[PDB]
């Protein structure tokens with residue numbers, strides 16, 4: 001018996017364009033949806049329904065099968081807020097394994113009146129045919145309403161493990177379950193596997209292969225300065241420039257003595273032995289950058305933004321902040337091709353974002369829409385889909401990182 | 403008979419209440435004969451004065467503007483249309499015209515009351531009716547009908563996986579690979595399946611026959627093309643004539659390789675009226691003539707054979723001009739094309755070619771559901787070098803180097819480190835070198851590039867250049883080889899001339 005869900009006051013349903021798919025993905029999607037229909041999970045629909053959400057087919061890790069990913073982003077934004085908070089202990093756990101508990105949803109009917117909004121279409125190659133249309137009858141994987149609406153039923157099947165094993169921290173985000181602990185990596189994989197049957201046996205593949213995140217070992221990428229034998233006019237110029245930038249963050253940084261070794265229009269390559277004042281000013285500056293600036297705090301009421309930079313050689317740098325210059329985190333990602341790496345980046349970065357603050361970030365990606373639209377689904381494996389926009393990375397910002 | 407589709411008016415809106423315009427007794431006459439034949443066939447039915455809604459009727463036409471404004475939205479009629487190059491060849495293709503499309507499809511019982519209209523009396527009331535079927539001119543008719551059509555077909559389709567059917571508004575294209583007689587048999591089999599649903603189709607001798615002119619294309623069951631374009635032979639051309647010409651020239655490029663419009667396009671520069679006459683340039687008539695020529699010889703697109711690979715080949719036609727063709731069997735084109743898109747005021751052929759690959763790729767997924775293997779005039783080394791050093795993420799699928807000049811290359815490369823014993827110019831419009839030299843010779847941004855240019859001019863084959871302009875830095879670091887700006891192009895000329903150049907930025 002179903003709970004009523006509604007769209008935020010005055011809002012209408014999603015009418016999102018479906019991005020063209022490959023015959024491969026389409027065949028998979030047909031194979032899939034045909035069996036979801038046979039099980040009454042979805043139903044075909046008519047002209048009177050004008051809504052639409054985009055679907056994609058992604059691959060599972062060590063599964064022969066394909067997963068159906070519905071981009072419920074637009075819908076999620078139009079869905080009523082529901083009235084689980086985030087465990088800041090989870091980020092301290094040693095090992096966190098991630099499970100896909102999405103299938104649980106397929107056992108809960110969805111309020112008949114809301115269904116029409118879950119509409120999606122299965123395109124056909126070259127517009128040769130109409131295009132198969134469906135709507136969900138149960139709770140769909142990916143929609144923010146689903147976890148909320150299943151919360152109760154969830155807490156119940158999880159109160160026994162949660163008390164028979166309260167050394168385990170368990171967090172649920174949409175189709176995902178984050179299981180934390182401090183146990184030995186061996187004791188973990190076992191306690192994990194028991195939960196699997198304790199869920200199966202209480203009516204689940206894990207994500208990220210069969211792996212553990214190790215949040216306990218996530219650190220900030222402090223800003224670094226070149227440490228070198230002799231310094232040329234170029235080196236110093238590069239140094240001052242970098243320092244000058246970082247001073248808007250760490251105002252204690254001084255360049256006075258460095259700028260001085262630079263008076264005169266000297267040859268770029270000319271080696272400049274550093275004075276005592278200079279050398280000790282750099283020392284201080286170096287000391288300052290050793291840690292993240294103080295004062296930055298996570299505001300739950302603000303958006304979590306994440307920009308990525310291409311460094312080269314399979315190396316990327318990213319930062320997570322809410323207010324420019326005020327990073328909440330910074331990292332690096334290294335090994336394929338550009339796109340694959342950028343996607344593995346985005347996903348890796350979303351997971352942490354989820355583990356640390358329990359919310360996904362808004363990415364700024366250094367790539368053209370069309371290229372991304374085209375290849376992302378190829379290497380994507382997450383059940384969620386962050387939001388994202390596309391930008392033009394300044395050559396100076398790349399320079400100032402890594 | 404056929405399932406009814408539930409319709410509703412937009413939220414918080416009432417049915418239409420618009421007054422019937424005054425009508426001619428002669429016109430009242432005809433409407434009543436028409437609306438009586440229609441009530442005998444069930445399409446409509448007299449209603450009582452219970453119904454307060456009304457739609458305008460004129461001579462039979464029913465104006466549904468109002469009701470339409472008030473009716474809900476339906477799912478998109480014909481999102482997109484297939485492109486002939488994505489079809490698989492057929493021995494036979496039969497087009498089935500469908501008359502009374504809407505009139506044989508029932509309308510939601512609870513909606514009919516909104517389709518009410520009135521036939522005025524001649525003597526000082528007028529008859530009142532409502533529709534029981536899909537009215538021509540109504541918002542949802544097209545969709546409810548496509549959808550319905552689809553349902554009727556499904557069976558026939560499951561029993562004839564061989565036949566292929568495409569629904570196009572009121573047409574129906576039916577192909578197969580059946581022996582001549584067999585095909586005609588199936589067709590007539592289909593025609594009855596539609597009759598069992600009051601749907602009427604043309605008899606074999608009244609059916610249109612191949613090729614079929616469709617959306618600017620000319621279609622056979624085995625080969626395609628675009629409907630024959632004739633190039634005018636005027637001696638006086640109007641801005642308008644040139645626009646249309648370019649327009650049409652353009653459309654042809656999807657199959658006719660070699661079509662160029664650059665010179666003709668150049669003719670619209672500065673024009674002040676659609677009727678202004680522009681005389682043709684020497685290069686412009688040379689271009690027209692060349693096209694007129696290429697056109698004279700008809701060329702046929704070939705259909706898709708899914709058992710074979712898709713090959714994509716790209717060539718540089720001119721500065722910023724690209725041509726490509728996709729085929730499965732050498733020169734046996736499924737489709738050709740051009741790309742002139744310049745993203746950003748500056749670029750290099752490497753970046754541009756990549757964008758071409760992307761457009762082609764996208765297009766292919768749309769037409770064939772897969773990407774082609776590319777044959778490109780650039781070597782992996784060249785590609786890799788630029789990719790490896792460009793700030794933006796990029797990717798190019800399976801591609802094979804093709805030695806077909808012109809090959810795309812990088813005309814220059816910035817040293818990654820300052821140069822030893824190469825003079826150092828400091829620029830901010832003027833410079834000051836370390837060796838004493840100087841010259842103090844426009845928008846803010848354009849004054850910057852001016853300096854750099856100066857320095858490049860007066861320097862030797864190796865140079866180190868320091869600037870505070872993060873802008874110019876950006877520009878030049880992207881190593882463009884072509885630009886909208888003339889200044890840049892001169893700089894680029896310099897750049898290509900040098901042996902080693904090192905550019906650096908300082909606050």
Ligand SMILES: Cc1ccnc2c1NC(=O)c1cccnc1N2C1CC1
Pocket residue numbers: 128484489490491492495566567568575576577578614616621622623624705
């Ligand atoms: C206009 C159109 C749109 C989509 N497909 C087709 C057609 N028309 C054809 O004439 C055609 C030609 C060759 C192969 N399929 C074709 N047909 C298929 C239906 C038999």
